[model samples]
Target: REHWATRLGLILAMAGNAVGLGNFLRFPVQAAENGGGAFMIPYIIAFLLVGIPLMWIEWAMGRYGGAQGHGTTPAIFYLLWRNRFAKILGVFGLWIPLVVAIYYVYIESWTLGFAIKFLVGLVPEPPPTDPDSILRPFKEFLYSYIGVPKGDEPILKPSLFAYIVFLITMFINVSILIRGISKGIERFAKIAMPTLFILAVFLVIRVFLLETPNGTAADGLNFLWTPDFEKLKDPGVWIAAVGQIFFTLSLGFGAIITYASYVRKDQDIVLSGLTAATLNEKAEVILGGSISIPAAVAFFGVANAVAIAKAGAFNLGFITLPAIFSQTAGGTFLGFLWFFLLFFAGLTSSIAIMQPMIAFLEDELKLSRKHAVLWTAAIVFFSAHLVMFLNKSLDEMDFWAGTIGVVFFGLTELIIFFWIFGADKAWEEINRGGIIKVPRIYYYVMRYITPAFLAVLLVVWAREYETHWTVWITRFYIIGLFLFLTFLVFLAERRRNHESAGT
Candidate 1:
């Protein structure tokens, strides 16, 4: 049977996957850091040209691939190659998710842990009487658990409890995966997603209504909404906006494609993609920037907000967010709501990540869902710890998988859909469920503008290597991994073709 039982289920599931830590946490900090008001310009532009269109392409591919009963790599390479080169890309597609799941799950553990703590009232109030008193405890707690030192320094010891937490979370994910799509993933999405949205809206209202001891809301609103055009001169703003578009929407990776693959071909994938992308951007811009950022700014002030922004999006999500939530109005309740929302969001995305790997095992090795989930989960669980145990390694993997990996994969998919698959076929799929027909000019944007923009950013990204070789190395590794997986997909496709044609 086809995977997704209903269109609504599929859409919600995709939406759940798309809206993760990035939506509520990353987007706001990025906007604030990039240029606040000015950031919105390029961000909106990228959202329209790159993010939305790519979402449609990924979804269409999934539906098309699902109709063929193939996994991500198989489906992509299958279309591209009557020969072997296609399989190379497919293999890379498969590996990307595996690598992503490892580190992703580790981050997910943070949410899971915070959610548990909040639900049980284990977490203390934030912004303690002494700033260092507050910051030091948190740093010590995280360091003890994850074996990472605070700041630029390194710590030599690992946290057993942290590893245990990671393992437990993995177990939970694996159990859900073994149950398959409808019973496990869809059911979770149906319940968890709505709960998350309700909580988010409620929390947003609560925070917006709040006034600090200073009796001013303007500080918060200005910190969030005010444009700092000076930030516009920094290329990092553009790169961050573009990267956020890719990561926040879950575009470049096979998660959307795998999720889409479960739905029926007749399901207007183009429209579905648009809906998901729109919802994602809505969460990022409207909900995230308009609501969450303002709330954070109001609660934390401009200097502190900017400080968190300087740490990059993920840090803002994992570190700054929890700290801020603990200090907001209805602090305890808001903390519960925020982390719970993140927990569910991570769950949804995690499932999509597993789906492609599961499909590969089932299709290629004839493994049952139970076996597939078990093996893949086990592998990722162990390998991912490597990231958690070593601070430098964790930083490297996060940058690679979270940033460069996302960009390279996204660009490759665009190449496959527009250049290799032919714009006509892609346009046909892209238009399927589209509410508004994309203007013909989108073709030029997709073909020339988007690629050029990505290339320029990539070059700029490379130039900054001397300043931060660690980050550059991380990105290079991610790109290299992509290339390797692509090569493997091509090889697999060649073998399959040879067998089929009796050549």
Candidate 2:
């Protein structure tokens, strides 16, 4: 009976969940790497073809499942497919969010940590060094005071900042979640999502107005938007576009479905889902891409900006940004603003990420909200520490879980929801109370095209990600994840069996 107190609350919560650091960081990088303006050709195509449809489908699944008093993917999947194996396939919904949120909080804590120091002026002013060298000091500060992985450098303490903020972040998430959906998550989203937009606007204005020697504002514009017509011929560019939309909308894994489950059967998901997806796209393509890459181009020249783009999104956000700001008028204040921007961007997502498992514990295991919150919090607190203190472990998990795992889960969803569950039934479920007409064609897209899109993404993602397994630890991490998932299902089955016997 836990439902969104208001339609706006549900929309904002869903939008907030989808709009995360990916909006600010990853979107720009994806654009920069995959043929810049040329990339958008496929990006928009994929957005319409894949993003919009999946958004509606996942939302439909969640709302439909929630009415049955089931919150996790396994429950939702089982309800729709009505098979034992469907529940097994659906565990990825619970698994990815729970596992990713643990380490994800560890990463999120960094932004909060950086924001605190910059806001309080604890961050020492960098030297008037070369533009390229500006990031060096930022790097030194991060690796040293922020708790460089143990043994990476001589460390007096293992990341006090990381530990403090991790607790603070999780505390905020648990506090909001424990209050129930309407009072907690929805309320937080209402305020936080708007604030996120406001800060993003302020930041984008700063970046767009930036005057630098390396490139003009027009050059920056061209970098993100000038569609290179030739690049569209490559399948790789199309795949990158697919991947970007997948990562950007927070789809193909599980969080969207969990959020959707809160919507009442009477509410209109079609328009509402598009509204949320549009908000995310605005934050990502317009605000996020416009904010960072243009600033980088304005400061570092077209080529240097490309080099920074090649360097990685974290490098740009954490290192290049501080360096770029060091040369700007309100360097210190802007530094604080940028990190807080990321912190809010990340917090919205971190809260949503934990909800599926919390729902699972509450709905499936019959735990009270307090017990469910405590269980999730306690578990994340311990595992996140491993990520906070260890660098190799962090890299390994990012490669395996964030890269490979999400794609695999998304591909699974395409098959289970569209094919195995019966396209006719899913279409019927989706149409119920839909405000906007989803053209009958998307049912075909859902049944055929989306699955094909996911398959292509899987092959390319696997090809791109294959070499990362060169590390022995990465292999172990993969195996360990498989075992971990197995154990989680076993626990759930045991609980379900006991309940069956008692009933």
Candidate 3:
């Protein structure tokens, strides 16, 4: 029911939502792993064709829903289609974001814990006499901190500090939610997003200035940017690029839709949405690219850095970057900055991820903001422990809820908004207050090309599916959550109809 207090605040909030750990930690790893410079070609194409168009579609839909006094996806979908099935399907919007938060906030807390370690000078100094001194200490630190015993099954028995920091970070998120959107989320974004950018810029400046034993920073840049054009022929590379765009842009999380609902009806979503997407890209391509991999390549050599990337985004962010930072002069301070920057990135996204559920409670269940925050916190706090203790649960949930569900939801959104709602009306909604007219071609692109692209992405993703007991457990957890949300939707709608009759 509240509107964004300022246009800049709204844009910054949206940008903050989109720019998360994916920008810094995940994007570089993806770019390097998916064929380095060759990945950018498809990445850019996907950003334009699918990413930006989806941003526009979500923003338009949210504004429409907000006009009808709805902020969450079920209500928004029902507002558009007036069908029970449409609202039920919209539960994905609720389920996906909440599932991500249960694990994501715990991951976000690691950045805070690491930052504190660097701040307190707790990371052991590398023994100059030993070749593996720096790597050994930090790798051990991560393993111990997260309770992964070396050479044993990686079940988490997280340390005391990990527990403390996780509580701190989770509390911070809930506190923000209790303040409501304009006062809490927007105001924090105005400060935190700018600070995050500044921190990234400082780290990047340090990265570029590094003189490592193995190679110059320029060599790292070359490794990242120099094209291996032959990789373009691989369909997997294209799929990876598309997936990166999808994750980095925060598409299908439904947070963007909730944020957009605060915008004035006649506001220019075209420019605002495009600006937020551009900010995310700049953070990813410029700042994100300039940091992790390049610094790793500088210290560890190109081959080693590439290999570290293949180990996964967590390894790079948690293990490798700290080791890289330790090798630099005044390294402790820079290391603190790196992890703190990631903390900021993760905090913004975790807030965004939680908002749709909070909005759902407030809008549909008629709960106040304080009650909504409490209810959301109780759910997240309980589930997050499972994410922490259960081995591979985070990855399982992320693969299903964060990765696969995102593309499917995006496809659902496109179909419902453009095809079912009528392309003419969708286009008109998208361009209602355009500062710059969207190219006419995207009408065709959104209607035809983007959906086709999403379909291909889904097929590619399904080609190699994993099966394990943990995976099944995660799947069942998700199914239970989805069913719970659907039942809530049923209750809310029935109550709405009953109230209408009484009125």
**lDDT of all the models against the reference?**
0.71, 0.79, 0.88
Query: Which digits, one per residue and each the tens of the lDDT, describe model 1 over residues 1-503?
Result: 45788778877888888988778766777777765777776787778878877777777787777777775755565575454556655565677677778777887787777777677887654555554555555555555555666567543355565667777888889878888888888878888778878877776676667666543445656655556667667787778788888888887667888887777766677666777787777766666665556655665676666676776545555555556566555566676777777777787778778777887767655578889899888777767755665456565665666677777777777877777888787778767665567778887887778777777788889788534444554456556656655654555456667778995
Better of 1 and 2 by lDDT: 2
Candidate 2, after superposition: displacement of residue 239 in Å?
Answer: 2.9
Clashes in each model (backbone N, CA, C under 3 Å)? Answer: 12, 3, 0
Candidate ranking (TM-score, best to worst): 3, 2, 1
What candidate 2 gets wrong by more than 4 Å, as runs, is 145-158, 460-485
lDDT of 3 by residue, 1-503 (tens): 89999989999999999999999988989987876788888898899899999999999998999888888889889877889889988999999999999998999999999999999999876776353776888888888898874555646789999999999998999988888889999999999999999999988988898875688778878877777778777888888898888899999989899889889888899999999999999999999998987888888788888888998668888888878777667888888999999999999999999999998988888889999898998898888887888778898888888888888999999999999999999999999988988899999999999999888778866784335566677778878989998998898998888989999
lDDT of 1 at 403: 76
Winner of 1 and 3 under lDDT: 3
In model 1, where is the ten-residue run with the lowest total lDDT?
465-474
Please tell me which predicted candidate would have the highest TM-score against the true structure: 3
lDDT of 2 by residue, 163-236 (tens): 77778888877888889889999999999988988989998887777886677656787888877888877888
Please identify which of the two predictions, 1 or 2, would achieve the higher TM-score against the true structure: 2
Question: What does each candidate score in C-alpha RMSD?
Answer: 3.5, 2.5, 1.4
lDDT comparison, 2 vs 3, better candidate = 3
Q: Model 3, residue 180: displacement in angstroms? A: 1.1
Candidate achieving higher TM-score, 1 or 3: 3
lDDT of 2: 0.79
